[PDB]
Design a protein around this motif. Structure first.
Motif, PDB file in Angstrom:
ATOM      1  N   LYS A 134       0.827  -1.203   0.000  1.00  0.00           N
ATOM      2  CA  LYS A 134       0.000   0.000   0.000  1.00  0.00           C
ATOM      3  C   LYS A 134       0.864   1.257   0.000  1.00  0.00           C
ATOM      4  O   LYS A 134       0.702   2.131  -0.854  1.00  0.00           O
ATOM      5  CB  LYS A 134      -0.932   0.004   1.215  1.00  0.00           C
ATOM      6  N   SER A 135       1.781   1.342   0.959  1.00  0.00           N
ATOM      7  CA  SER A 135       2.671   2.494   1.062  1.00  0.00           C
ATOM      8  C   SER A 135       3.507   2.645  -0.204  1.00  0.00           C
ATOM      9  O   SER A 135       3.640   1.702  -0.986  1.00  0.00           O
ATOM     10  CB  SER A 135       3.585   2.355   2.281  1.00  0.00           C
ATOM     11  N   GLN A 136       4.070   3.831  -0.398  1.00  0.00           N
ATOM     12  CA  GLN A 136       4.887   4.107  -1.573  1.00  0.00           C
ATOM     13  C   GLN A 136       6.285   3.508  -1.422  1.00  0.00           C
ATOM     14  O   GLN A 136       6.771   2.811  -2.312  1.00  0.00           O
ATOM     15  CB  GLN A 136       4.984   5.616  -1.804  1.00  0.00           C
ATOM     16  N   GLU A 137       6.923   3.783  -0.289  1.00  0.00           N
ATOM     17  CA  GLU A 137       8.268   3.279  -0.026  1.00  0.00           C
ATOM     18  C   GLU A 137       8.303   1.752  -0.021  1.00  0.00           C
ATOM     19  O   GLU A 137       9.316   1.151  -0.380  1.00  0.00           O
ATOM     20  CB  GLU A 137       8.784   3.813   1.313  1.00  0.00           C
ATOM     21  N   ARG A 178       6.073  -0.434  -1.749  1.00  0.00           N
ATOM     22  CA  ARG A 178       5.839  -0.953  -3.096  1.00  0.00           C
ATOM     23  C   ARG A 178       7.034  -0.732  -4.020  1.00  0.00           C
ATOM     24  O   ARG A 178       7.377  -1.598  -4.815  1.00  0.00           O
ATOM     25  CB  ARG A 178       4.588  -0.312  -3.705  1.00  0.00           C
ATOM     26  N   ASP A 179       7.668   0.421  -3.916  1.00  0.00           N
ATOM     27  CA  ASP A 179       8.806   0.744  -4.773  1.00  0.00           C
ATOM     28  C   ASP A 179       9.981  -0.211  -4.570  1.00  0.00           C
ATOM     29  O   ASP A 179      10.511  -0.761  -5.534  1.00  0.00           O
ATOM     30  CB  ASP A 179       9.263   2.182  -4.526  1.00  0.00           C
ATOM     31  N   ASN A 238       8.940  -3.666  -5.773  1.00  0.00           N
ATOM     32  CA  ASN A 238       8.729  -3.680  -7.217  1.00  0.00           C
ATOM     33  C   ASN A 238      10.066  -3.847  -7.927  1.00  0.00           C
ATOM     34  O   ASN A 238      10.160  -4.517  -8.957  1.00  0.00           O
ATOM     35  CB  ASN A 238       8.053  -2.384  -7.678  1.00  0.00           C
ATOM     36  N   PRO A 293      11.725   1.078 -10.576  1.00  0.00           N
ATOM     37  CA  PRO A 293      11.950   2.436 -10.074  1.00  0.00           C
ATOM     38  C   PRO A 293      13.434   2.742  -9.901  1.00  0.00           C
ATOM     39  O   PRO A 293      14.116   2.119  -9.090  1.00  0.00           O
ATOM     40  CB  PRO A 293      11.239   2.456  -8.712  1.00  0.00           C
TER      41      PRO A 293
END
Length: 83
Positions: free
Chosen positions: A9-12, A14-15, A18, A46
């Protein structure tokens, strides 16, 4: 199979993952036989975590040889015959 780490969910979170899974598909798939597409992760990699991906990547190589079929010389059994 498309994405799978949707649990992020969070950005840090998932990045980093990923790019983590990216490092996996690239090497892990070509070395052993992991069923994934290398370019699939190439378009979702990313550059902000390009460092992490390489960390897991280099690691994946260490296991690329240790891992099962695909590329393993020292995977012999009973120390008798190599296969």
């Amino acid at each position: 199979m498309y994405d799978w780490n949707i649990a992020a969910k969070s950005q840090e979170e998932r990045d980093k993952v990923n790019v983590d899974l990216a490092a996996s598909g690239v090497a892990y798939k070509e070395r052993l036989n992991i069923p994934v597409i290398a370019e699939q992760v190439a378009r979702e990699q990313p550059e902000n975590l390009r460092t992490y991906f390489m960390e897991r990547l280099r690691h994946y190589r260490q296991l690329s040889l240790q891992l099962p079929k695909g590329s393993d010389p020292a995977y012999q059994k009973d120390d008798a015959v190599k296969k």
